Amino acid sequence: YQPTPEDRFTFGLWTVGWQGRDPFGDATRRALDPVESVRRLAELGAHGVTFHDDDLIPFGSSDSEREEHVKRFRQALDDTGMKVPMATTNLFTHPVFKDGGFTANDRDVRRYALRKTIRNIDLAVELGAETYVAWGGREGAESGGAKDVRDALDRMKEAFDLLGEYVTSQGYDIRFAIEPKPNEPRGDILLPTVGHALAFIERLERPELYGVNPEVGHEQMAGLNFPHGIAQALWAGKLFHIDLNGQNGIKYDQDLRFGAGDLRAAFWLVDLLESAGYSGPRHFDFKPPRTEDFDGVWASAAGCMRNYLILKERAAAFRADPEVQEALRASRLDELARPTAADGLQALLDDRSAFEEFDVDAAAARGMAFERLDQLAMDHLLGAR
Amino acid sequence: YQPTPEDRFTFGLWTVGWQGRDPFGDATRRALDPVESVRRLAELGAHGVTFHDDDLIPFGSSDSEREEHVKRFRQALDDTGMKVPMATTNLFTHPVFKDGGFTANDRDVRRYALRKTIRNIDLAVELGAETYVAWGGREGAESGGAKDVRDALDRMKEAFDLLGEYVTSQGYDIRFAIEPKPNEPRGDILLPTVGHALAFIERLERPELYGVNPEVGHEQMAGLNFPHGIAQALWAGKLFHIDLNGQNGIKYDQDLRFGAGDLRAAFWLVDLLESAGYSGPRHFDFKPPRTEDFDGVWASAAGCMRNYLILKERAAAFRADPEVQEALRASRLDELARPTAADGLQALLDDRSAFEEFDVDAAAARGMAFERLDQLAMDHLLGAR
Amino acid sequence: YQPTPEDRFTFGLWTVGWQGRDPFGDATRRALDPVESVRRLAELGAHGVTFHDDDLIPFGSSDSEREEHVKRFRQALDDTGMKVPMATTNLFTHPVFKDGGFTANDRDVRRYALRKTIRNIDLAVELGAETYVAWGGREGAESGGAKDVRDALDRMKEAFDLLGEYVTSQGYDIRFAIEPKPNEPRGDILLPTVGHALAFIERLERPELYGVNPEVGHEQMAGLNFPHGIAQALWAGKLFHIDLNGQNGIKYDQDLRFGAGDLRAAFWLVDLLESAGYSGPRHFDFKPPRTEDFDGVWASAAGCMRNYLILKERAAAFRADPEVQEALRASRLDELARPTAADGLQALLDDRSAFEEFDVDAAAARGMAFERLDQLAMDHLLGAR
Amino acid sequence: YQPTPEDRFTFGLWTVGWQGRDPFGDATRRALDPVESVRRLAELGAHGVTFHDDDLIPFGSSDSEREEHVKRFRQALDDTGMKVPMATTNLFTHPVFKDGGFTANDRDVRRYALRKTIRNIDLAVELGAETYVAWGGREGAESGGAKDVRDALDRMKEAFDLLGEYVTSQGYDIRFAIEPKPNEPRGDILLPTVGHALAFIERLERPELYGVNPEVGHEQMAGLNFPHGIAQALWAGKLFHIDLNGQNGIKYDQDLRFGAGDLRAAFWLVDLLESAGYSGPRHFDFKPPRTEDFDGVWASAAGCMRNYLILKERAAAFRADPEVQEALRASRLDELARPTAADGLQALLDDRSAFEEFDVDAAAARGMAFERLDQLAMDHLLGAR
Ligand SMILES: OC[C@@H](O)[C@H](O)[C@@H](O)CO
Ligand SMILES: OC[C@@H](O)[C@H](O)[C@@H](O)CO
Ligand SMILES: OC[C@@H](O)[C@H](O)[C@@H](O)CO
Ligand SMILES: OC[C@@H](O)[C@H](O)[C@@H](O)CO
Ligand SMILES: [Mg+2]
Ligand SMILES: [Mg+2]
Ligand SMILES: [Mg+2]
Ligand SMILES: [Mg+2]
Ligand SMILES: [Mg+2]
Ligand SMILES: [Mg+2]
Ligand SMILES: [Mg+2]
Ligand SMILES: [Mg+2]
Ligand SMILES: [Mg+2]
Ligand SMILES: [Mg+2]
Ligand SMILES: [Mg+2]
Ligand SMILES: [Mg+2]
C-alpha cells in the first residue's frame, strides 16, 4: 500500500501545516515553511499540494515579499516534481470577513472579497491549477434577522458570475468548485450540502464553469450519506474536486485523517470513485490532531494515503468476486440499471402486467438478499473471505 | 387568533387520522372516517384536506367500493365548503414497496408504482387538486451495495419524466412537488434535503412542472435551518407547497404540531413565508401524539393554526416596528440587498477603493449590531416590547 | 469465524422474529413460532435466546394457553441445548402503557406494570435466567408539562425498589439490568444514557441488585462513544448484560446487525469486552431489515456472530503485537495506568518538580504518538499489517 | 424585565471578554481588562463574576504581577459591590494540557494540573467563592487506543479525591462542581453528560463535596433534554451551579446568549429552577458572537438576563393559572406525584385491581390531555392567553 505520485494524492498546505489552535487551545506545533511541507509530502509519495492565498503569502505582504515566497515555493515544486492542481482564497480568517466575503452585509467587504479572489486566481493559473475552490465558511448567520437568504443568494450569484466573467475574459481554463458545509464557523452556512450547491450552480450564468468540492466530514456533519451525495454530484457531471478526511457524525468539524471516522463510508466512497473512473485529485483536507508532534503529522498524512489504497484494493476485490457478482444479481442491482419503461408511456398505461394483473403479494414476498450482499462486502473490507 | 378558511390552512387525512401505531406500539385510537375528519377540521376553521390514495380508498378496493368512498368524501366537502388542494400516492406502506416505488430494484415494482400514481393523479384532478406531492420514503438503502445511486437517480428521473408526459398528455394544470427527507424509514433516503431535490429537478425534461414540498421536521432531521432552505426554494421559484410541523432536532421524525419543536425557527419561517407573499396552502403534516384521545387530536390540530397566527402577528409587528427598521439599517440589511458590482467587472478591477485603498481594519472594526437586532426579534416574539 | 455455543451469543425472540412493521410500513414477514427460532438459532451456533413476556405468551392468554406456550418452548430448548440467560417485560406495546409503565401518570397503570413484571420474573427464574432487563421505552414525554421528572424518578425508584424487595423475598438470584435509551418512542426517555442509569442505581435501596444493559445503537443515538460508556459501566462494576447491534449516528433506532453501523466502534467495543474479561452473554438486539425474507433473517443473525468473531481476532492480534506494545509505551498508556500521587497530598504539595520546577514547554513539546498507534490499529482491523 | 443584583446573575470574565477567535478566525475584539468587565456588568445589573485562574492572572505571571492583578480586581469588586461566587482552573488552553490535565497520559502533567488547581482554590476562597468548577475539556480522545477509559477514570477519581482532601485539610467550605460536555475540543470527552458525572461522583471518597455544573448547550450537543437532566441533578441533590446559554442542537458548542437556541427548553428550564427553589447563581457561560463590537457584547449580556426574567414571569403565570392547574389535574400530574404502592409489596401482590381485575382497555382509552396542557404553556410563553 505504498503511494506514488501516479495515485494523484494531494494535500493542502494548511493540513500538515496546522499548528493546532482550536476553540480552547493554543498552538502545539511551530509553523511549517511551505518548502519543507512540499519536500516532506513528496517523500511520502504525494503528487501535489494546494493552497489558500494566505497560506503561501502572509496576509499584507509587499510585492517583493510576495515574489520571494512564490519563488521559493516554485523551487520546491521543481526540486520534487510536485504539482499544484487546486488553489483557493482565504475569505474567513481575517476579521473583515466576520459576516462573510461574497455575502457580507457590507458591500465594500463583498467587493474586496472579489478582488482578493481574482488576484489569487491569477496566481493559481501561473502555478498550473485546474480547479479553484470556494468555501464560503463565513457566509451565513447565527440569528434570523441578520441575513436575508434570498438577498444573500443574489449576492453569491453575482460574485460567482463575476468570477466566471473574469476567467472567460482572460482565456483561463480553470474551473470553480464550490465547497458546501452545513455549519461552523457560522451557526448555519449558506449552501449547506452538496445538493444546495448543485442547485445553486444551475442558476449561474455559465453553469458549465462550476462544480462541487464535497468534503467527507462536511456532509457527515449533517448526518448525510457522503457516498450518496457524491453519486448525485457524479450523476450531475459536477464532481470537479473532492476533499477526503474523517468525521465521527454530527459534531464539530474534526478533520481526522481519511479512513478514520466512518470506515465503512470510506470503503463505499472509494468503491464509487473507482467504479465511476473519477479522474481528479484525491485531496486530503485534514488536520493531524494537536496531540501530535511533527513525526505524528507525517504519520497521519501517510495514513490518509495508505487507507485510500487499502480500501481501493478491497473494493476492487469485492466487485470482481464472482460470488459478489452473483449476489448483486440476486439483489436485482442489474434490474435497477435497466430502464423502467423504454416501451413508453402509452405502452406502460396499456400493460396489464403493471397494474390489473400485477401480483403484488408475490412481488412483496421476494426477499432482496441485501444482508448476504452486505456481509460479503464486510468480509471483503476486513480481509475475512 | 381564530382561523378561518381564508387563512388557507390544510391538513392531511392521515394527520388527525393517525391511529398512533409506532415502532414499538399498537394503535391508541380507532380509525376515523374521512367524512368525520372533514367535518371536524371545517369546524376548527380549516380551508381543506389532502390525501394519499390509500387514505381515501382502502388498498385493494373494488370499483363500486371506490366510487362510494369518493361519493361520501365529495358530499362532506360539499357540506363544509372544504377544498382538496393537494394529493399524493402511498408508495411506502405496502410490503411490495419495501425497496422503493420509483427506484425499487425490481423493475415490475417500478412500473406498478407509476401506474398507482397515475391512477391517483386522475382522482386528484377530479377533486380539484393543484399540487401532486411525491414523498419517496422507501427510495434509499440500509447498506452500500444494495442501491447504486446513479442508477437509482436515472430511474427516478424516468419516473418523474413519465409523470410529466402524462399530465401534459391529459392537459392537466396540476404540478408536482417532491418532498425531501434525509432518513426514516430507509437508513438513508434519496434526495435527502431541499437542495438535493432542487438540484434533481433541474435535470428533468420539463423542470417547470416540478417544485419542492419541504417539511419543517425533515430538514431539521439533518440539523439544517428550515427557513434558510425555504429561502433557497423561494429564490429558485420552486416552493410549490409546504408541510408544517415541529421537530426537536436530530432524531426520529416526530411530526409534532406546528409551533412545537423549534419555536424560533417557526417564527422565522412564518416571517419569511409572509414577507415573500407565499400564496400556497399552509399544510400541516403532523401527528397528534398517541397519548391523546380524539379531543386531544382536535386540540392539537387547532394548536397548529393558532401558533401560525400568533407567529404571523409577531413577525409582522417586528418588521413594522420603526426601531426594528432602524436596527436593520444599523446591521446593513439594506446594503445586503444592493448589487455588489452593478458598475461591472472592469470597473470593480479598476476601483482602488476595493483593494489597494480598502481599509480592512476600519471595516473589520465595524460591529454588525446583530445581537441588538435579535433581542428586538425575541422581544417581539414573546410580547415583551 | 464459526460460532459455537461456547461463544455465549444470544438473541431476542423479537429480533429474528421481527415481522418488519415500521412507522410507515406493514409487515414484510410472517410471524415466527418461537420453537422455530430456537431451532434455527441453535443451528447457526447461538448459545441462547431471550424474551419479553408477550413474545413467548400472547398478551391476554388463558392459563392453559400459557402452559402450552411455555411447554413447547421448553421442549425446543431441551431439543437444542439452548439457554435462556435473560428475560424482560413488554411495558411499551399495549396502548395502556402510552404514558409509561412504572412512571405512567396514572397510578393504576403503574401498579399493573409492576404486577406484569413480577409475573414474568417468576417465569424468567423458572427458565433459568440470571438477568432481568428493564427498558422503560415509554417513560418520558413529548412536552414539558406532561411529566415532572423529579416525581417520575421517585416513581421509578419505588418500582425498582419493590422489584428488589420481591426477588429478595423469593430468594431468587436474578439481578436487574436497566437499559438506557435517549428517545424513541417518547420524545425524550428518562434515564437516557448509561451515565443517567448508573447515577439512578446508586439511589436505589439495594444498589447491588441493579446494573445496566447498554445497547450500542442507543448510546450512538445521542452521538456518544459506546466503548467509553461501557468502560464507565465496567469501572462501576455494573455491566450486567449488553445489547449488540449497529447504528449510523444520530437518527431513529436502526437496530442493524452487529458490525454494521460504526465498524471502528465495534472493534474498540470488542477489544474492551475481551480485555476486561466480560463474562456475560453477547446478546444481539437487532432487526433484520424488512427488505429481507427468512433466508436473509438467518444470514443477518449469522453475520452478527461472524463480525464479533472477526473483531475479536483482530483486537487480540493488535494487543499481542510487539510493535503495538512498543507504540502503547511510546504514547504513555503505561503511565496513564500508574497512580498520579501515591506519595500523598503533602508530598505532591512539597514536590517542586510538580510546579515551581516543572518545565511546561518541554512537556508540551512531547508528541503523544497517537496517530501511529491508531494506524497500527487500523492496519490490524483491516488485515493490512 | 430589569435585572438587579438580587436576581443573582453572574458572568465569566471569559464570556464578555471573548475576543472572537474561532477554528477559522482571528480576534475581532481587543482584550478587556477584568476591571472594565466588572464595571460594565455591574452597570447592567449583574450580581457577580467568575474566573479561570488564567483569565485573572496571565499565565506565567511573577508574584508581584499576580498581586497587582488581584489588587486591581478586588478594587473593582469593592467599587461595584460585585461578588465572585465561583472560580475554576484553565486546564485546557496551554499546549501542555493537549492530552488532558487530571487524565493526561503523562504523569508529570497530571501532577502539575493538580498543583495549578490547588493554587487557584486558595485564591478562589480568598475572593469569597462557594463553588469551584472543573471542566475537563481535554480529558478524552480522538482515537480508541490513545486512552484506556477505566485507567483514566481511576486517575480522575484520584485527582478529585486529592482536591477533596486538600479543601478538608484547610477547613474551606468550598464545594466542587463537575461540568460535563460530550465532545469539543476532544473527539469524545470523559464524563460526557450530567448522568455520567453524577455516576462518577458517587464513587469519590467524599461524595458530599461534589456536584454538577451542567451547561444548557453541552447537554444539547448530545441531543438530550436539558430540563430533564437538571431534574435528575436536583433529584440527586447535586445541582451546585449551572451554566446558562443557548445552542441549536447537535453541532459545535455555540455558546449563544441565554434564550437563544432552544427557546422552549429555556422556558421549561426556568420553570424548573424556580419551582424547585434553586438558590445558586444564575451564571451565563456564553460568547457574544464575533460579529459584534463592544456595544454588542453588552447588549448580548443584557439579553441573557432579560430573557431569564421574561421566562420567569411566563412560567410563574403558567403555574398560577387556574385553567393550567385544572389541565394539570386532567393530565394526572397530581397522580404522578403520589406513591405507587405505599400499601407495600404484599398488598400490591394481593390487589386484584392491579392485575386480575384491571380493565386495561378502559385505562388505555383515557386520553392524557397533554396537547391542551402544552398549548396553554405555549400561550403563556408567547403572551397569547
Ligand atoms: O472547513 C474548512 C474547509 O474544509 C476548508 O479547508 C476548505 O476546503 C478550503 O477553504
Ligand atoms: O415522513 C412522512 C411524509 O411527511 C409524508 O407524510 C408525506 O408528506 C406525503 O407522503
Ligand atoms: O429500543 C428497544 C430496546 O432495545 C428493547 O428491544 C429492549 O432491549 C428490551 O425491551
Ligand atoms: O465549553 C467550555 C466550558 O463551558 C467552560 O467555559 C467551563 O464552564 C469552565 O471552564
Ligand atoms: Mg468519516
Ligand atoms: Mg472540514
Ligand atoms: Mg475542505
Ligand atoms: Mg420544529
Ligand atoms: Mg415528517
Ligand atoms: Mg410531509
Ligand atoms: Mg454502530
Ligand atoms: Mg435499539
Ligand atoms: Mg435493546
Ligand atoms: Mg438552547
Ligand atoms: Mg459551551
Ligand atoms: Mg460552561
Short mmCIF file of N, CA and C in Angstrom, two decimals, chain A residues 98-99 103 105-108 110-112 115 144-146 149-150 154-155 158 188 193 195-196 202-203 222 225 228 231-232 235-236 268 331-333 335-341 343 348-349 351 354 356 358 364 366 370 373, chain B residues 98-99 103 105-108 110-112 115 144-146 149-150 154-155 158 188 193 195-196 202-203 222 225 228 231-232 235-236 250 268 331-333 335-341 343 348-349 351 354 356 358 364 366 370 373:
data_model
loop_
_atom_site.label_atom_id
_atom_site.label_comp_id
_atom_site.label_asym_id
_atom_site.label_seq_id
_atom_site.Cartn_x
_atom_site.Cartn_y
_atom_site.Cartn_z
N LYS A 98 -15.86 38.77 9.05
CA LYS A 98 -16.67 38.20 10.13
C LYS A 98 -18.12 37.98 9.75
N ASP A 99 -18.68 38.70 8.82
CA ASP A 99 -20.06 38.42 8.35
C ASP A 99 -20.07 37.87 6.95
N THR A 103 -21.02 37.36 0.58
CA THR A 103 -22.35 37.72 1.09
C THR A 103 -22.27 38.53 2.37
N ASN A 105 -22.83 41.57 4.70
CA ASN A 105 -23.81 42.65 4.57
C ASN A 105 -23.16 43.92 4.05
N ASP A 106 -21.95 44.19 4.42
CA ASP A 106 -21.23 45.39 3.95
C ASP A 106 -20.77 45.23 2.51
N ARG A 107 -21.26 46.10 1.63
CA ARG A 107 -20.93 45.99 0.22
C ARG A 107 -19.44 46.18 -0.06
N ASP A 108 -18.77 47.04 0.67
CA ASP A 108 -17.35 47.25 0.43
C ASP A 108 -16.57 45.97 0.74
N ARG A 110 -17.79 42.88 0.31
CA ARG A 110 -18.07 41.97 -0.80
C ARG A 110 -17.17 42.27 -2.00
N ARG A 111 -16.97 43.58 -2.29
CA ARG A 111 -16.09 43.98 -3.40
C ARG A 111 -14.65 43.60 -3.10
N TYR A 112 -14.18 43.80 -1.91
CA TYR A 112 -12.82 43.41 -1.52
C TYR A 112 -12.66 41.90 -1.64
N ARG A 115 -12.03 41.08 -5.19
CA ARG A 115 -10.67 41.46 -5.66
C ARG A 115 -9.61 40.53 -5.09
N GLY A 144 -31.74 35.00 12.96
CA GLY A 144 -32.61 35.04 11.80
C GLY A 144 -32.69 36.37 11.09
N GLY A 145 -32.58 37.48 11.78
CA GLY A 145 -32.75 38.79 11.17
C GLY A 145 -31.50 39.29 10.50
N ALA A 146 -30.36 38.67 10.81
CA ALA A 146 -29.05 39.15 10.40
C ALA A 146 -28.78 38.99 8.92
N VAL A 149 -31.72 35.46 3.31
CA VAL A 149 -31.02 34.46 2.49
C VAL A 149 -31.30 34.66 1.01
N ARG A 150 -32.48 35.11 0.60
CA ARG A 150 -32.68 35.40 -0.83
C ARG A 150 -31.75 36.49 -1.30
N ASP A 154 -28.67 36.18 -4.00
CA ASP A 154 -28.45 37.12 -5.11
C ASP A 154 -27.00 37.63 -5.12
N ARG A 155 -26.46 37.98 -3.97
CA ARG A 155 -25.08 38.45 -3.90
C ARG A 155 -24.10 37.33 -4.25
N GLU A 158 -24.08 36.88 -7.94
CA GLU A 158 -23.34 37.98 -8.61
C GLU A 158 -21.86 37.70 -8.53
N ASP A 188 -25.29 28.70 10.92
CA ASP A 188 -25.70 27.98 9.71
C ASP A 188 -24.97 28.62 8.56
N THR A 193 -25.10 21.85 1.92
CA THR A 193 -24.86 20.48 1.45
C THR A 193 -24.51 20.46 -0.02
N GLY A 195 -26.27 19.03 -2.24
CA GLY A 195 -27.46 19.31 -3.02
C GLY A 195 -27.71 20.81 -3.18
N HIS A 196 -27.59 21.56 -2.08
CA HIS A 196 -27.84 23.00 -2.15
C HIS A 196 -26.85 23.66 -3.11
N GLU A 202 -26.93 25.66 -10.93
CA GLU A 202 -27.82 25.66 -12.11
C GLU A 202 -28.36 27.05 -12.37
N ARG A 203 -28.33 27.99 -11.44
CA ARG A 203 -28.83 29.35 -11.65
C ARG A 203 -27.74 30.35 -11.97
N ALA A 222 -24.01 16.92 8.76
CA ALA A 222 -25.49 16.95 8.64
C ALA A 222 -26.05 15.53 8.75
N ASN A 225 -25.33 10.78 3.99
CA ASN A 225 -24.50 9.71 3.41
C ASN A 225 -23.60 10.31 2.36
N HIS A 228 -23.62 8.70 -1.14
CA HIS A 228 -24.83 9.04 -1.90
C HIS A 228 -24.71 10.45 -2.49
N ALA A 231 -22.47 10.37 -5.40
CA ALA A 231 -23.19 9.78 -6.54
C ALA A 231 -24.06 10.84 -7.21
N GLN A 232 -24.78 11.65 -6.45
CA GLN A 232 -25.59 12.70 -7.08
C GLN A 232 -24.71 13.72 -7.81
N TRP A 235 -23.67 12.05 -10.96
CA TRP A 235 -24.83 11.98 -11.86
C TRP A 235 -25.02 13.31 -12.56
N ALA A 236 -24.80 14.42 -11.88
CA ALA A 236 -24.93 15.78 -12.43
C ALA A 236 -23.71 16.17 -13.27
N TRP A 268 -17.21 2.59 0.89
CA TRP A 268 -18.16 2.79 -0.20
C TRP A 268 -17.80 4.02 -1.03
N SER A 331 -29.85 -9.69 -5.80
CA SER A 331 -30.43 -8.48 -5.20
C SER A 331 -30.99 -7.53 -6.26
N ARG A 332 -30.95 -7.93 -7.55
CA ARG A 332 -31.54 -7.17 -8.67
C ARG A 332 -30.84 -5.83 -8.89
N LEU A 333 -29.55 -5.72 -8.62
CA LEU A 333 -28.83 -4.50 -9.00
C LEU A 333 -28.76 -4.37 -10.51
N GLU A 335 -31.23 -5.19 -12.52
CA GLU A 335 -32.55 -4.66 -12.91
C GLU A 335 -32.68 -3.19 -12.55
N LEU A 336 -32.03 -2.75 -11.47
CA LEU A 336 -32.05 -1.30 -11.12
C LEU A 336 -31.49 -0.47 -12.26
N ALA A 337 -30.50 -1.02 -12.98
CA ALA A 337 -29.81 -0.32 -14.06
C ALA A 337 -30.58 -0.40 -15.40
N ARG A 338 -31.70 -1.07 -15.48
CA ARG A 338 -32.47 -1.16 -16.74
C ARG A 338 -33.62 -0.17 -16.71
N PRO A 339 -33.87 0.54 -17.84
CA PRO A 339 -34.98 1.49 -17.88
C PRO A 339 -36.28 0.88 -17.41
N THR A 340 -37.05 1.70 -16.69
CA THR A 340 -38.36 1.27 -16.21
C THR A 340 -39.36 1.06 -17.37
N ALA A 341 -39.33 1.96 -18.32
CA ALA A 341 -40.37 1.97 -19.38
C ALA A 341 -39.82 2.52 -20.67
N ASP A 343 -40.40 1.16 -23.33
CA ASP A 343 -41.57 0.92 -24.20
C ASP A 343 -42.45 2.18 -24.29
N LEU A 348 -46.87 1.52 -21.22
CA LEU A 348 -46.98 1.29 -19.74
C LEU A 348 -48.46 1.35 -19.33
N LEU A 349 -49.18 2.36 -19.82
CA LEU A 349 -50.60 2.52 -19.47
C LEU A 349 -51.43 1.32 -19.95
N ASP A 351 -50.27 -1.80 -20.30
CA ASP A 351 -49.67 -3.06 -19.83
C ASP A 351 -50.40 -3.56 -18.61
N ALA A 354 -48.55 -4.43 -15.37
CA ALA A 354 -48.10 -3.32 -14.49
C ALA A 354 -49.20 -2.88 -13.54
N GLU A 356 -53.35 -4.21 -13.43
CA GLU A 356 -54.55 -5.04 -13.26
C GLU A 356 -54.14 -6.47 -12.93
N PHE A 358 -50.86 -7.36 -11.95
CA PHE A 358 -49.61 -7.41 -11.16
C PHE A 358 -49.92 -8.10 -9.84
N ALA A 364 -44.03 -8.77 -3.31
CA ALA A 364 -43.68 -8.38 -1.95
C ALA A 364 -42.94 -9.51 -1.24
N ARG A 366 -40.77 -11.55 -2.36
CA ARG A 366 -39.40 -11.82 -2.87
C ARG A 366 -38.41 -11.05 -2.00
N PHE A 370 -30.28 -8.38 0.59
CA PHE A 370 -29.28 -7.35 0.83
C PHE A 370 -28.33 -7.67 1.99
N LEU A 373 -25.49 -9.82 0.70
CA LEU A 373 -24.61 -8.97 -0.10
C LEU A 373 -23.73 -8.10 0.82
N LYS B 98 -41.10 -2.34 -0.29
CA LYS B 98 -40.04 -2.40 0.72
C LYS B 98 -38.70 -1.92 0.23
N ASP B 99 -38.40 -1.98 -1.04
CA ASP B 99 -37.13 -1.40 -1.56
C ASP B 99 -37.39 -0.18 -2.40
N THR B 103 -37.79 3.76 -7.51
CA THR B 103 -36.40 3.27 -7.57
C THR B 103 -36.26 1.89 -6.95
N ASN B 105 -35.41 -1.89 -6.83
CA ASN B 105 -34.55 -2.66 -7.73
C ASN B 105 -35.37 -3.48 -8.71
N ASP B 106 -36.50 -3.99 -8.29
CA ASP B 106 -37.38 -4.78 -9.17
C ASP B 106 -38.12 -3.89 -10.16
N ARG B 107 -37.88 -4.11 -11.45
CA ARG B 107 -38.50 -3.27 -12.47
C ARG B 107 -40.03 -3.38 -12.48
N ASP B 108 -40.58 -4.53 -12.21
CA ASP B 108 -42.03 -4.68 -12.21
C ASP B 108 -42.64 -3.82 -11.10
N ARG B 110 -41.34 -0.92 -10.03
CA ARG B 110 -41.25 0.47 -10.50
C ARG B 110 -42.40 0.80 -11.45
N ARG B 111 -42.74 -0.14 -12.35
CA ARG B 111 -43.86 0.06 -13.29
C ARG B 111 -45.18 0.13 -12.52
N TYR B 112 -45.40 -0.72 -11.57
CA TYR B 112 -46.61 -0.69 -10.74
C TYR B 112 -46.70 0.63 -9.99
N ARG B 115 -48.02 3.20 -12.30
CA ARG B 115 -49.46 3.05 -12.60
C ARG B 115 -50.31 3.45 -11.41
N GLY B 144 -24.55 -0.30 1.55
CA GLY B 144 -23.95 0.36 0.40
C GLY B 144 -24.10 -0.37 -0.92
N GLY B 145 -24.13 -1.68 -0.93
CA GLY B 145 -24.19 -2.43 -2.18
C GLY B 145 -25.58 -2.57 -2.72
N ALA B 146 -26.58 -2.29 -1.90
CA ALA B 146 -27.98 -2.55 -2.21
C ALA B 146 -28.54 -1.63 -3.27
N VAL B 149 -26.65 4.55 -6.54
CA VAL B 149 -27.44 5.79 -6.51
C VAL B 149 -27.50 6.44 -7.89
N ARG B 150 -26.47 6.37 -8.71
CA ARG B 150 -26.59 6.91 -10.07
C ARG B 150 -27.67 6.19 -10.85
N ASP B 154 -31.22 7.73 -12.22
CA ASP B 154 -31.74 7.52 -13.59
C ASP B 154 -33.18 7.01 -13.56
N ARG B 155 -33.49 6.06 -12.70
CA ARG B 155 -34.85 5.54 -12.60
C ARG B 155 -35.80 6.61 -12.07
N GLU B 158 -36.59 8.98 -14.82
CA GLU B 158 -37.52 8.38 -15.80
C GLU B 158 -38.93 8.47 -15.27
N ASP B 188 -30.86 5.68 4.68
CA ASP B 188 -30.68 6.97 4.00
C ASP B 188 -31.67 7.01 2.88
N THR B 193 -32.54 16.28 1.12
CA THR B 193 -32.78 17.67 1.54
C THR B 193 -33.43 18.46 0.43
N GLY B 195 -32.10 20.99 -0.97
CA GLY B 195 -31.12 21.24 -2.01
C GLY B 195 -31.01 20.09 -3.01
N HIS B 196 -30.94 18.86 -2.50
CA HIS B 196 -30.80 17.71 -3.39
C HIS B 196 -32.01 17.61 -4.31
N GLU B 202 -33.73 20.18 -11.77
CA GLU B 202 -33.12 20.88 -12.92
C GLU B 202 -32.73 19.90 -14.00
N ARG B 203 -32.62 18.60 -13.75
CA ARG B 203 -32.26 17.60 -14.76
C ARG B 203 -33.46 16.88 -15.33
N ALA B 222 -31.82 16.64 9.59
CA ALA B 222 -30.41 16.76 9.16
C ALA B 222 -29.75 17.94 9.90
N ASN B 225 -31.16 24.45 8.77
CA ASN B 225 -32.02 25.61 9.05
C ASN B 225 -33.17 25.62 8.07
N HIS B 228 -33.79 28.87 6.09
CA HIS B 228 -32.79 29.07 5.03
C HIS B 228 -33.13 28.20 3.81
N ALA B 231 -35.93 29.70 1.97
CA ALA B 231 -35.43 30.86 1.21
C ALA B 231 -34.79 30.40 -0.09
N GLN B 232 -33.97 29.35 -0.07
CA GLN B 232 -33.39 28.87 -1.33
C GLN B 232 -34.47 28.35 -2.28
N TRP B 235 -36.05 31.39 -3.72
CA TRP B 235 -35.10 32.01 -4.66
C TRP B 235 -35.15 31.29 -5.98
N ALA B 236 -35.29 29.98 -5.99
CA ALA B 236 -35.36 29.15 -7.20
C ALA B 236 -36.76 29.20 -7.84
N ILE B 250 -32.25 16.29 15.95
CA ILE B 250 -31.80 15.22 15.06
C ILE B 250 -32.22 13.97 15.81
N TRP B 268 -39.22 32.47 12.42
CA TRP B 268 -38.54 32.95 11.23
C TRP B 268 -39.14 32.35 9.96
N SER B 331 -27.53 47.19 10.95
CA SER B 331 -26.92 45.89 10.66
C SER B 331 -26.65 45.71 9.17
N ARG B 332 -26.94 46.74 8.35
CA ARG B 332 -26.66 46.75 6.90
C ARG B 332 -27.47 45.70 6.14
N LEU B 333 -28.68 45.38 6.58
CA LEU B 333 -29.54 44.51 5.76
C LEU B 333 -29.94 45.22 4.47
N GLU B 335 -27.91 47.16 2.76
CA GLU B 335 -26.74 47.02 1.87
C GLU B 335 -26.62 45.59 1.34
N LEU B 336 -27.06 44.59 2.12
CA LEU B 336 -27.06 43.19 1.61
C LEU B 336 -27.90 43.08 0.36
N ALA B 337 -28.98 43.87 0.28
CA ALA B 337 -29.93 43.82 -0.83
C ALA B 337 -29.46 44.67 -2.04
N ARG B 338 -28.34 45.34 -1.98
CA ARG B 338 -27.85 46.15 -3.12
C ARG B 338 -26.79 45.38 -3.88
N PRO B 339 -26.83 45.41 -5.23
CA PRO B 339 -25.82 44.71 -6.02
C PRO B 339 -24.41 45.06 -5.58
N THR B 340 -23.56 44.02 -5.60
CA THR B 340 -22.15 44.21 -5.26
C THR B 340 -21.42 45.08 -6.30
N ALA B 341 -21.70 44.84 -7.55
CA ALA B 341 -20.91 45.47 -8.64
C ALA B 341 -21.76 45.68 -9.88
N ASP B 343 -21.68 48.29 -11.42
CA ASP B 343 -20.70 49.04 -12.25
C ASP B 343 -19.95 48.09 -13.19
N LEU B 348 -14.94 47.25 -11.28
CA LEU B 348 -14.50 46.66 -9.98
C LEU B 348 -12.98 46.47 -9.99
N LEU B 349 -12.44 45.94 -11.09
CA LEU B 349 -10.99 45.71 -11.20
C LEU B 349 -10.21 47.03 -11.11
N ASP B 351 -11.22 49.76 -9.45
CA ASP B 351 -11.63 50.52 -8.26
C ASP B 351 -10.62 50.33 -7.16
N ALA B 354 -11.67 49.17 -3.65
CA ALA B 354 -11.99 47.74 -3.45
C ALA B 354 -10.75 46.92 -3.15
N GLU B 356 -6.60 48.24 -3.22
CA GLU B 356 -5.33 48.92 -2.89
C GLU B 356 -5.58 49.91 -1.76
N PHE B 358 -8.51 49.92 0.22
CA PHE B 358 -9.56 49.46 1.15
C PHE B 358 -8.93 49.34 2.54
N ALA B 364 -13.23 45.98 9.46
CA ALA B 364 -13.31 44.89 10.43
C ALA B 364 -13.81 45.41 11.78
N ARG B 366 -16.04 47.58 12.43
CA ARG B 366 -17.47 48.00 12.46
C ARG B 366 -18.29 46.82 12.97
N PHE B 370 -25.84 42.66 15.34
CA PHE B 370 -26.83 41.60 15.20
C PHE B 370 -27.48 41.17 16.51
N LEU B 373 -30.39 43.50 17.24
CA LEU B 373 -31.48 43.16 16.32
C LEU B 373 -32.19 41.89 16.78
#
